[PDB]
Every structure is written in C-alpha cells, then in structure tokens.
Amino acid sequence: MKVRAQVPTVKNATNFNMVADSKTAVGSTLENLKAAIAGETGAHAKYTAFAKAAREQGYEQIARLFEATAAAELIHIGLEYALVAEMEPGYEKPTVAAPSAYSCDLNLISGANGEIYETSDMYPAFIRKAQEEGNSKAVHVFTRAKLAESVHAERYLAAYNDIDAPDDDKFHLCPICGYIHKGEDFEKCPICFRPKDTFTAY
C-alpha cells in the first residue's frame, strides 16, 4: 500500500464501498462496535492458532505473519473497545475458544477470505451506518481497521503464492493501526503516517 499525500479516509478514498449482497447484520453503531470486537476476537484466536500450526509445519515466516496480524486485530479491538467503554462503562471484552488450524496454505486462504469480508463487507457496512448516525469517532475507528484488513488480505495472498519461497524479511506492525509491511523498504505507515522506527518487528 502506497503512502499518499494525506491519510486515507472515506472522504478521499474510493475503495470503501460495501458489497451489494452483504452478509453483515447492521444495528446501531454501538451494537456494530461490539459486533466488530466479537469478530476481531475470533480473528485473533484464529490467527494465533494458525501461527502455532505454521511453526509446527515448518513455515516460520508465515507463522510470524499470522502473529503480526493477530496483533493487528488486537489493536483494532483496542480502538473499538475504547469507544464502547465511553458509551457503556460496564461493557467487558468477550473471550472465545480457539478454532482448529489446518494446512498452512488453507489457513492463509481462510485468513484472506476473512480479511476480504471485513474490508469489503463488514467494516464498509459499519462505516456507512456510523456516517448515517453522525458518529465520526466510529467512522474513524472502523476506517482504520478496514484499511488494514485489505493489507492483511494482500499479505496473506503474497505468502500463499510464495509459500515455498520464504525469506528472512521481518513483518513490521504499526503501533496504532493494523498496517503490516514486509521488509524494511518503507518510511511511514500509509494508513496513519506513524514513522517506521515506531513499528514492532515480527
């Protein structure tokens, strides 16, 4: 993902449309924030299981990608939780069980499909609802998550295509958003502009 003159938003980007045949239940923004947290909690558990399986299967770099992406989902949960907490202090983040991890290639495909669903269906649906309800804070949070998900999808597909050609590149995760970069060739986050030196290496 290229760095643009300004950070991408629904006001200056053209990949924020929701698939017409959406599989997402849309409620109030508060309900959507909770739904997103629930979904991301599941994603985190899935990627964590996928990472453990990848390591056992001999795919250390892919394991690191799953670990970096799980960490990215945790950042999303944090952003969403902060908003829910201000509106409903009694709200407690949910916990989920770990799902099964299968062959690494299929896990990468499962990951890619989930990321695509989140970036083109779920988050766009929630962003639209937040816009229609005037919840700018939610639009911001959902937008940041949405942008990282399509990057995650690309990273998973790249890893799938090069499943038998790994390298020593580290995956750098942004400190405040889910952006992940493979390798050292970048200066700042294309989603939030945080400098490279603030990223965490996986």
Residues that bind its own copies (CB under 8 A): 1-2, 4, 8, 12-17, 19-20, 102-106, 108-110, 112-113, 116, 119-120, 150-151, 153-154, 157-158, 160-165
Q: Out of its own copies, Fe ion, none, which partner does residue 169 contact, by CB within 5 to 8 A per kind?
A: none
Q: Out of Fe ion, its own copies, none, which partner does residue 174 contact, by CB within 5 to 8 A per kind?
A: Fe ion
Minimum Å gap between C-beta 112 and Fe ion is 10
DSSP-based three-state secondary structure for 173: strand
Q: Out of its own copies, Fe ion, none, which partner does residue 19 contact, by CB within 5 to 8 A per kind?
A: its own copies
**Among 79, 122, 177, 180, which residue sits at the site for Fe ion (rule: CB under 5 A)?**
177
Cα separations (Å) of 39 from 12, 74, 93, 121?
27, 11, 11, 13
Distance from C-alpha of 171 to C-alpha of 158, rounded to nearest angstrom: 13
Number of Cβ within a 10 Å radius of residue 159: 25
Name beta bridge partners: 188.
195
Number of Cβ within a 10 Å radius of residue 66: 30
Q: Out of Fe ion, its own copies, none, which partner does residue 149 contact, by CB within 5 to 8 A per kind?
A: Fe ion
**Among 81, 171, 179, 199, which residue sits at the site for Fe ion (rule: CB under 5 A)?**
179
Spatial neighbors of 146 by CB under 8 A, at least 6 apart, are: 16, 118, 119, 123, 124, 127
Distance from C-alpha of 126 to C-alpha of 114, rounded to nearest angstrom: 16
Residues that bind Fe ion (CB under 5 A): 40, 43, 73, 115, 118, 149, 152, 174, 177, 179, 189, 191-192, 194
> Binding site membership: which residues?
40, 73, 115, 118, 149, 152, 174, 177, 189, 192
